[PDB]
Paper text:
Calcium/Calmodulin (Ca2+/CaM)-dependent serine/threonine kinases (CaMKs) constitute a family of 81 proteins in the human proteome that play a central role in cellular signaling by transmitting Ca2+ signals. CaMKII proteins form large oligomeric structures. The N-terminal kinase domain is tethered via an autoinhibitory helix and a calmodulin binding site to a C-terminal oligomerization domain that organizes the enzyme into ring-shaped oligomers.
In contrast, tetradecamers were detected in the crystal structures of isolated oligomerization domains. This non-physiological oligomerization state has been attributed to the absence of the kinase domain. Here we present the oligomerization domains of the human γ and δ isozymes that were refined at 2.7 and 2.8 Å resolution, respectively. While isolated domains of the δ isozyme were tetradecameric, the CaMKIIγ oligomerization domain crystallized in its dodecameric state, thus providing a model for the oligomerization state observed in full-length CaMKIIs. The oligomerization domain formed a hexameric structure with a diameter of 120 Å and a height of 60 Å surrounding a central cavity of only 17 Å. Thus, the main consequence of the insertion of an additional subunit per ring in the tetradecameric assembly is a considerable widening of the central cavity, to about 33 Å. Each oligomerization domain in the ring also contains a deep cavity that has been suggested to represent a peptide binding site, based on structural homology with peptide-binding domains present in nuclear transport factors and scytalone dehydratase. In support of this hypothesis is the fact that a glycine or an acetate molecule, respectively, originating from the crystallization solution were partially occupying this putative binding site in the structures of the CaMKIIγ and CaMKIIδ oligomerization domains.
Numbering used by the authors:
A (entry chain M): 343 to 402, 407 to 471
B (entry chain G), L (entry chain C): 341 to 402, 407 to 471
C (entry chain I): 338 to 402, 409 to 471
D (entry chain N): 336 to 402, 408 to 471
E (entry chain H): 339 to 404, 407 to 471
F (entry chain E): 338 to 402, 408 to 471
G (entry chain F): 341 to 402, 408 to 471
H (entry chain J), K (entry chain D): 342 to 402, 408 to 471
C-alpha cells in the first residue's frame, strides 16, 4: 500500500515538473485527453480537455520550486487513485525577492496500459 | 446506454449525499461516506481534514428552506468500482434580510463502491 | 401590403412577453411554467455567471418570495414562421426599504418558439 | 426517437461551428468577414454600448477600425433549434489574452446569439453579452 | 408687439406652474389632462432611458402619498415661442421641502418642457429634467 | 399614406440633428451658427447648472478644442405644429482615450427646432450626463 | 459725529433685521426688505433669488440664539444709499445639547425710501 | 431710462472684469475706490480693505472668457448702484482642455466726479 | 532681588488661577470683574476671528460632571510695574460621555494690567 | 497720544515680520528679548524659550516672493513701557503648483520698551 | 516503538487541551511544569513565565471541539519530546452559528517521575 | 553554575545558527539542523514544513548590513541531550528608503545533541 | 551575590506595592509611596511632564471588575545606597466591555529614593 | 539652593553632551558616557527593553547622510537622588531637514538615569517615547 501510494506521489511530481519546465508534450502525455479541471484561472467554470491549458504553456530565466505538502492518497480499486495535497510554490517576485504561495490541489489518476494518467483536478487558492 | 446509466448512478448518489447534508442527517451522511474520508473545504481553513470528527460539529450545532442544484456535472468512470464527479453546487437559501439568495461552490467528489454501495472517499469544495 | 403582418406579428411577441412578465410579477409559477419551454435555458444575475437549465432554479424564487414593469424600446426579430426573439429594457418600478418609489433596469433578451399554436420562451438573458 | 438525437446533434454543431467562425472574425479584426456573417439589421446588447440596444454595423465598425495573441473558448454551449431556419446559442465566452504586466490572463462573458438561415447561410440577427 | 410676446410667454409660465402644482398635489387626473398622452421624458428616475406615455409616472403618483409641505419656484424661466401653437420653456426648478432631520432644505433641477396647443388648451409633449 | 408622411417629416428632424452634430464634431462654428437660432438657449454639463444664451458660450469650445463617431440612438420626434418640432435621443459618442483605446460615452439630449424661411433651426437644447 | 452717526444708523438697522430673522417675524422682515430684494445665499444653492417668496418658507416652517455682527464696515454711497459688510457670528445650541458658534460673511445693501432704510440686496457665504 | 442706467452699471462691471483678466492693475485701480472692501475666497473668510491685498495677485500671476450671467442691478439713488450676477469663467486646464467655473458675485458702485467706482465686492465659490 | 521677582510672578499666577476658577464655576459676575471691559480674545470657539468685549463670552456662561484645571509650566513676563503676561499649558480634567475621566489641553496666553490696585485681563489667546 | 502710541507698536510689529520674511536673524535678535517665549504650531504644543529654537528656521530656510498683511490689529497699551498687539497675519506666497495662495494665522505679541527700543518678549501664533 | 512513544505525546497533548477546554486549572497545573514559559497572542509579544498569567483566563472565562491536525512529534532523548500541530477549534459564534478557527502550536514535553509535563509552548495565530 | 553554562551552550549554538542564516551559508545551516527539521514560520503560510528543501530556495535566491539580537532568551534543559530556547529575535537592517530599521519575531527552537553536536530539530517563528 | 539580588528584590517589592495601591484605588497608600514632588511622563498627560500629586488625584477620586498586573522582565539598577531605578513591561489583565478577559501592556520606568528608611517614587515614565 | 541649582546643571550639561555625541554619530564618545549595562526603552526597540551597547551600535555604524540637526532639551526637571545618582526628564525637540527639502521639528518624551562612577557621570538607563 505504501509503495503504491508512492507511485501516485511520484507521478504527481512528474506532472508538476512538466508544468514548471513549460513542457506541453510531457504534460499532454500525463493527462487523459478528456481531463476536466476546476482552477482559479478558469474563473469558476469546469474546463475540459487540453485546449484551455495550451495557452498558458505557449505564452508563458526565473527559478521555481514546488513542494507537494502533506499528500494523502486514496487507492480506489486497482487502476484508480486520488491524491490531495498543499502545493507550495517558491518563486521570485517583481521586487527581485524570493516568495512562497500555496494552493489546495486534488488530482484523480487512472491507469491505462500501465501508465497513470490524470483525469481530473481541482485547485483552489 | 451503459456509460450514460453508470454516470447517472454517481449523480444520483451525489444527490443523496447533498440531501443528507441539507437534512442535517449525520447517520445518513455517515453511511454514504468512507470512514477515512478526506476533505478540502473553506471551513477547514486551508487544511486537509480527515474522518468524520470535523463534520459532526456542523451537523450537531446547525425551518429556513434550502434548495441545491448540481449544475453541469461531469463524471469520470475510473475502473469498475471507482468514479469521480465534478460540478457547480448552487445553493438557494433565505437571507438575513428575509429574501431569497443563491450562492455557489466548485465541488469535486471521489467515489468508491464497497459491497455494492457507492461511498464518498474524498471531496474538495472551493468558494 | 407586406408590413401589415410584420407589425402585427411583432405585437404578438410583445404581448406574450408582457404576459410572461405579468406571471412573474404575480408570482404565478403554474402560469410561468405554461409559457416556458420545459428546457428553458437562462443567463441571469441571480445564477451568478452560470447558464441554468429548466424550471428547478426559478421555482425557488416563486415559492419563497406594488410593482410595475415597463418593456421599453422593444425590438423584435421574426426568425422564420415559428420563431422570434425580442430585446428590450425592462424597467421595474417598486417600493424601497425607505418607503419610497424607485425604478431599476435590466437589459433582457428572450427567444420564443411556437409549439401547437402557443408561443413559448426557450431562452432568456438578463443583465444588470 | 433515436434518429432525431443524431439529427439534432449535427444541427447543433452547425450553430457552434458558425459561432466559432464569427468569434474568429472578431479576433482577426476582419470586418468584411464579420459583415458577411451578421444580418445588416443586427441588434446587440453589450457592455461597450453602456446599457443601450445598438442596431446595425455602424457601432461595431469603430472597434474594428481602431483596435499580443488571443484565444477564445466557447464553454458549455447550449443550442436551441427553433424551427428549420432559426437557432440560438448560449455560452460562456472565455478569452485568454496577454496583460499590461506582460502576463497571460483569462476573462469571461456570458453570451447569447440568435441565428437565422438566409439563402443557405446562417446569419447572426441579435446578440447579448454581459460581463 | 413686445406686449403681445410678454403675455404669450406668461401663458406658458402659467401653464408650467399649474403642471408642477398638479405634481406637488399628487393629482394624476390633473397631470393627465395637461400632458399629451404620448409624452416623452428624460429624468433621473428613468435612469438614462427615454420613457414614453403616462405608465411610468403613474407609479410615482399612486405610491408617493406624502403630510409634509413643499414649495416650488420656477427660477429664471426663458420661453421660446416656436410658431403659434408651440412653445418651450427652460428653467431652474427649486424645491423647498422638509428633510429627515426635521429641517427645511432646498434642492434644484434644470428642466426643459415643450408645449403644444391642441383645441385651445396647452399640453406638455416632452420634458427633460437633470439633477 | 398619412403615416408614411409623419414618418418623412420626422426624418427631416433626425437629418437636421445629424447635420448639427456633424458640424460640432468637425469644429465648424460657421456651420453651427447657421443651424442655430442666434438666441439659442442651452442647458449642458459644461454650463455648470446655468442656462446659457446665445453663441458666446459655445464659441470658446470651437475656437480652443483623433477620430470620433456619434450615434443618435432611439430618437423620438414630436411634431408640434407645421413649423416646430422637438427631438429626444441618447447621443452615443465613440472616441479614442488617453490610454490609446476606443471608448464610448453617452448623454441624454433634447433639441427644439423651429423652421424659419424654409430652414430648420435649433432654438434650445438640454444635454445631461 | 456725522459719518460715525450715519454709519451707526446702518448698523442699527442691520441689527433690527437680524433680530426679526431670529424672532421668526416675517411681517417685520417684510417691512425692512424692499419687495424686490435679491439674495445670494447657501440655501439658494448658487442661484440668485428674487422677492420674498423664497424666504417665506423658512419663516413659516422653522432653543436660544445670539447673533453678533462682527467687524462691520459701512460705506455711505450717497445720501439715500449704504452698504454694510460684516462677519455674522451665530451662537446656538447643538443636537448634542451644547453651545456652538458658526459664521458667515455677509453683505447688505440699503436704500432709504420715505425716511425708512430698506434692504435691497444681500449676499451670504459660508 | 432705468434700462439705460442699468446698462451703464453692467458696462462698467464688464470693464472691471476685463481689467482683471488683462492683469492691468493701473486700470483696476482707476475703477476701484481706494478704500474698496472685499469678501472673497482667497481672503480666507476675512474682509480685506484697500488695494494692497489684490496687488500681489496682479504682480505675480492661456486664453480666458468671462460671462456676466443673469445680472440684476439695483439703482439706489442717483450716484449709487449695486449689481449681482453669476460670473462664469471659461479657461484652459492643466490637462490641456477647456473648462468653465462659476462664482456668485455682488458689486457696489458709487459715482464720483462722473466716473462710476467700485466700493465693495463679495465673491463666493 | 529674585525673591521680589518670584513674588510678583506668583501674583500673576494667582490671579490667572482665580480667573480660571470663575470660568469653571460659571460665575460671569466674577469673570466680568477680573476682565477689562475691552478684553480682546483669540480662541477656537471664535472660529479664527478676534472678538472684543464681554458679549461673546456671556452666551457660554448663560447656557452651559466635576472639572479640574492645572496651569502647567507657567512663564510670566513682568513688563513694567503695572503690566504682565503669562503663558501656560492649560490642562483640563473632566468626565466624558462614556462616563470616564479624560484630560485635554490648550496653549494659553494672557496679558494683565493693574488698574486701581486690581490686576485685570486685557487680552488672551487660546489655541487647541 | 493714543492713536500715535498704537502706531508705534504696529510699526515695530511690521519691522519684525519683515525681518522674518527677509530671513535676517541678526535683525530678529535685536528686536526680540533674549528670553522670548513662544507658542507656535512648529513648536508642537510646547512653550519654547529663547532664540535657539528659531535659529534653525532662519539658518535652513528663497528666490520666491512673499507679502504679509497685518489685518485688523488691536493694540492694548498696558502702562508706559508695555503693549500688546493682536492681529490676523495674512501671508501671500507662491505655491508648489506655481500659483499665488494666501494663508492665515491668529497672532499675539507682547512688547516691552527697554532703553527706548521696543522688544518682543512673548508671542503666540495659532493656525 | 517510535510510533507508540509518539502516540504517548499526542495523547498527553490531547489531555492538556481537554483540561483547557474544560476550564480545569488544577488539571492544567498538574500537566504543566511550574516554570512553563509561553509565547501566545494574548501575551502580546512577550514571553510569559509560570502559571500566574494563565490563571486569570481560567478564573474569568457554548460547546467546543478541538482537533489536533497533522501532528509531528520529535523524540529528543528518552525523557524529552516536542510536538507541532495545527490546532483547529470548532465553536459557536455571536451570530449563533458554528465556526472554525486555527492556530499553529508547538509544545515541549519533559518526563519527570514517569509523568510527561509541558515545559514550553508557542502558539501563533 | 553548571546549569548556567549548559544554558549558554544553547544560546551559543542558536547564535551560530542565526549567523549562518545572515551570512547566507546553507552548508553551515545544514550542519546545524537535523535533516528532518520541522518548522512553523510566516513564509510557510500556516503549514508545517519538513526538511531542508523549503529553506534552500531562500538561501540560493537571497551586501546589506544586518544585525540580530537574541533578546531575553529563556532556555529549558529537558534531559541531558535535549534543550529548547525561546527568545525575541530583533533584526536590525537597512531599508528601501536607505535607512536603518528594526523588526521582531518570537522564536522557539528545540535542540538535540547527537554525537556531541547540538542540532536544531524544530522551530517556530511568528511575527 | 545574594545581597545585590535581595536589594533588587526590595525595589521590585515596593513597585508591586505601588501598583497594588493603584489597582485598589487607594490614594492615601499611593501618596505614602510617592515623593510629594514626583514627576511623570504618561499617556494621559498628553505629552507634558506633570508634577506632584494634583494630576493623579482626579483619576483616583473619579475611577469608581477584577484586574491583575504583572511586572514582566524587571531590570533594576542600584545607583548609590539610597537610589534605584526599575524598568519593566507592565501587563494588565482586565475585563472588557464585551464582558471578556483582555491584556494590555506598557513600558514603565520608575526611579526610587530612600528617605528615612522608606523607598519613595520620585519619577516615572509610562509609554504605550 | 546655590549647590542644588549647580548640581542640577551638571546633569543637564552631561545630558547635552550625550545628545551631542548621538547627533555627531560618535559611538566612542557615546560609549564613554554610557554604563556598559545601559538598559533602554525606545520606539526603535519595538516594545522590548534592550540591554548594553549592541543594539545602538547598528544605528551609529549605518546612519551617515551634510544634513544639519539641532536638539533642544526643553523644560528639564532633575531629581538628585543621593550624592552619586540623578535622573532627568525633558522634552527632546529635534529640528531637522525633511525629504521635501524643508525644516521640521519633532518631539519625544525622554527620561535618563545617571550614576557617577570615579567622578564621571554615566547613563545607566533611558526611556524615550514618541
Amino acid at each position: 500500500v505504501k509503495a503504491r501510494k508512492q507511485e501516485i506521489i511520484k507521478v504527481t511530481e512528474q506532472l508538476i515538473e512538466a508544468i514548471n519546465n513549460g513542457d506541453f508534450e510531457a504534460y499532454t502525455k500525463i493527462c487523459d485527453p478528456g481531463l476536466t479541471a476546476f482552477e482559479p484561472e478558469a474563473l469558476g467554470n469546469l474546463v475540459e480537455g487540453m485546449d484551455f491549458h495550451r495557452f498558458y504553456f505557449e505564452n508563458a530565466n526565473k527559478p521555481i520550486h514546488t513542494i507537494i505538502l502533506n499528500p494523502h492518497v486514496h487507492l480506489v480499486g486497482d487502476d484508480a487513485a486520488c491524491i490531495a495535497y498543499i502545493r507550495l510554490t517558491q518563486y521570485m517576485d517583481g521586487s527581485g525577492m524570493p516568495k512562497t504561495m500555496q494552493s489546495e490541489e486534488t488530482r484523480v489518476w487512472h491507469r491505462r496500459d500501465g501508465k497513470w494518467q490524470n483525469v481530473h483536478f481541482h485547485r483552489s487558492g
